[PDB]
Amino acid sequence: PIHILAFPFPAKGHINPLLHLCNRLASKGFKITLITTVSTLKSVKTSKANGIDIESIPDGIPQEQNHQIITVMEMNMELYFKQFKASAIENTTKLIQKLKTKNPLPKVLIYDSSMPWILEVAHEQGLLGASFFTQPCSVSAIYYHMLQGTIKLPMVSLPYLPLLEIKDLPGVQQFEDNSEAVAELLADQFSNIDDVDYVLFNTFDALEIEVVNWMGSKWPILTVGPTAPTSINYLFETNTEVCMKWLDQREIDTVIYVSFGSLASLTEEQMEQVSQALIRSNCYFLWVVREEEENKLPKDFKETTSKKKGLVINWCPQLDVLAHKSVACFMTHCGWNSTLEALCSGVPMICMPQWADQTTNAKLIEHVWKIGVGVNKSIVKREEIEDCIRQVIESERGKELKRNAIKWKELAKEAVSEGGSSCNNIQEFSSSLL
């Protein structure tokens, strides 16, 4: 069998879409070794079913309490990303040298596009290099224009993108002192793209026809998304039993699914507004509040006041939740995976973007794909959230958003089915490796 190495950046929004691609490739006969940091491995709870080998490398940066890697990394981004880079180069080289003592020998390294320097580790080791982009082509295009200097990370017109306000650009300012380094890192994804053996994007053509066509005029790219299979689907604790039995008690189109993803943290004040909005709307809701973020919920919220209509849980099986017929809409921070998974599940969205590409995704959701509405800041107050919920759950606009979401779900299904663009591109990638 052809042996594929996979190295995501150590954050769930990078691990998960690459894992899903690895499961698809393992279904086609490939052997997979997934490279994770020891910090990632601490949260891995289930892996036996996958059949994928997991090999750990050191974090390469300080280990602060039980914080994840990007948490420690954002204390000093320019320094700790560079330390992470130096350590990952050394330790992936070492690991590959060890993997070269075992059959089947590794042939290709699929690595996170935010680690472009792993291409030279791949090539130095005699492997093919595949850069895996975990953001859409539309957002990635902005990073490319930054590298060409067409735009500086300080309305905005870019080829094949909708007119953007400044509020719609990838939110690098939120990182403050780390803003300048975060912008250099994103632009650097394209620094060696001409030397990459395979450029993979987690998107499907019908979602962004023109920018995909534009990018294809420059390089051979492979759109292979959604990689998520819209179990073996999760490495981490997803509380699946609790979540799905609660949803099974809910009627069609009644549940607000709420999640701000794996990284974003809402202030105690913002949390109160969401809690009250969710209560004051008379809707059922499943709200993912990460364990380290409970304590910022109001006093009795998790234990008592949410009990009538809500399920507050520290992590859920998001794919299964978004697929459940009871879920009427998704209040989301607009991370790309949550965006794509909801879109491919036919679930309209309430956009509460926090930073990085989420602001741009929220613009695409509301104005291009037309499957969500955006909250307006003043802090996002409960009245604004409740108004967005009514728009989605009750209003005629909400029925249009749902119909639009269902049309995207159908095109996403075509893309990953036999003869669809993403299925074709994965097959092409698979064949090139033989």
Ligand X SMILES: O=c1ccn([C@@H]2O[C@H](COP(=O)(O)OP(=O)(O)O)[C@@H](O)[C@H]2O)c(=O)[nH]1
Tell the residue number behind the tokens 């695409």, with chain if given. Answer: 364
Q: Does residue number 143 form part of the binding site for ligand X (CB under 6 A)?
A: no
Q: Does residue number 11 form part of the binding site for ligand PIT (CB under 6 A)?
A: yes
Count of other CB atoms within 10 angstroms of residue 380: 17
| Chain breaks in the chain following residues, C–N > 2.5 Å | 154, 230, 378
Phi, psi of 356 (to 5 degrees): 50, -140
- Structure tokens, 311: 């399920």
Q: Does residue number 182 form part of the binding site for ligand X (CB under 6 A)?
A: no
Q: What is the CA radius of gyration of the chain?
A: 21
Helix axes 421-433, 12-27, angle to 10 degrees: 70
From residue 81 to residue 120, what is the string marking binding to ligand PIT with x (rule CB under 6 A)? ---------------------------------x------
Q: State which of residues 288, 331, 349, 350 lies at the interface with ligand X (CB under 6 A).
A: 288
- Structure tokens, 26: 């393992």
Phi, psi of 114 (to 5 degrees): -75, -5
Pick one of ligand PIT, ligand X, none as the site partner of residue 19 (Cβ within 5 to 8 A by kind). none
Q: Which of residues 313-332 bind ligand X (CB under 6 A)?
A: 315-316, 318
Cα gap 201→203, rounded to integer Å: 6
- CB 185 → ligand PIT: shortest distance, Å? 6
CB 274 within 8 A of CB 297: no
Interface segment toward ligand X; rule CB under 6 A; list 92-100, 120-128, 163-171, 336-344: 336-344
| Closest CB to ligand PIT among residues 115, 255 | 115
Q: Does residue number 262 form part of the binding site for ligand X (CB under 6 A)?
A: yes
Pick one of ligand PIT, ligand X, none as the site partner of residue 302 (Cβ within 5 to 8 A by kind). none
Q: Does residue number 335 form part of the binding site for ligand X (CB under 6 A)?
A: yes
- Structure tokens, 42: 């601490």
Pick one of ligand PIT, ligand X, none as the site partner of residue 357 (Cβ within 5 to 8 A by kind). ligand PIT
Interface segment toward ligand X; rule CB under 6 A; list 72-80, 150-158, 310-318, 399-407: 310-318
Interface segment toward ligand PIT; rule CB under 6 A; list 7-15, 97-105, 311-319, 324-332: 7-15
Q: Does residue number 361 form part of the binding site for ligand X (CB under 6 A)?
A: no
Q: Does residue number 356 form part of the binding site for ligand PIT (CB under 6 A)?
A: yes
Pick one of ligand X, ligand PIT, none as the site partner of residue 10 (Cβ within 5 to 8 A by kind). none
Residue 221's DSSP bridge partners are 199
Phi, psi of 372 (to 5 degrees): -160, 165
Cα gap 180→172, rounded to integer Å: 8
Ramachandran region, residue 10 (left: φ > 0; alpha: ψ -120 to 50; beta: rest): beta
From residue 10 to residue 29, what is the string marking binding to ligand X with x (rule CB under 6 A)? -xxx--x-------------
The type of residue at 387 is: D
Q: Which of residues 314-353 bind ligand PIT (CB under 6 A)?
A: 335-336
- Structure tokens, 413: 């299904």
Tell the residue number behind the tokens 């698979």, with chain if given. Answer: 430
Cα gap 203→178, rounded to integer Å: 28
From residue 390 to residue 429, what is the string marking binding to ligand X with x (rule CB under 6 A)? ----------------------------------------
The residue ranges of DSSP E strands in 100-197, in sequence order, are 106-112, 128-133
Pick one of ligand PIT, ligand X, none as the site partner of residue 318 (Cβ within 5 to 8 A by kind). ligand X
Q: State which of residues 99, 109, 137, 263 lies at the interface with ligand PIT (CB under 6 A).
A: 263
Binding site for ligand X (CB under 6 A): 11-13, 16, 238, 259, 261-264, 288, 315-316, 318, 335-338, 341
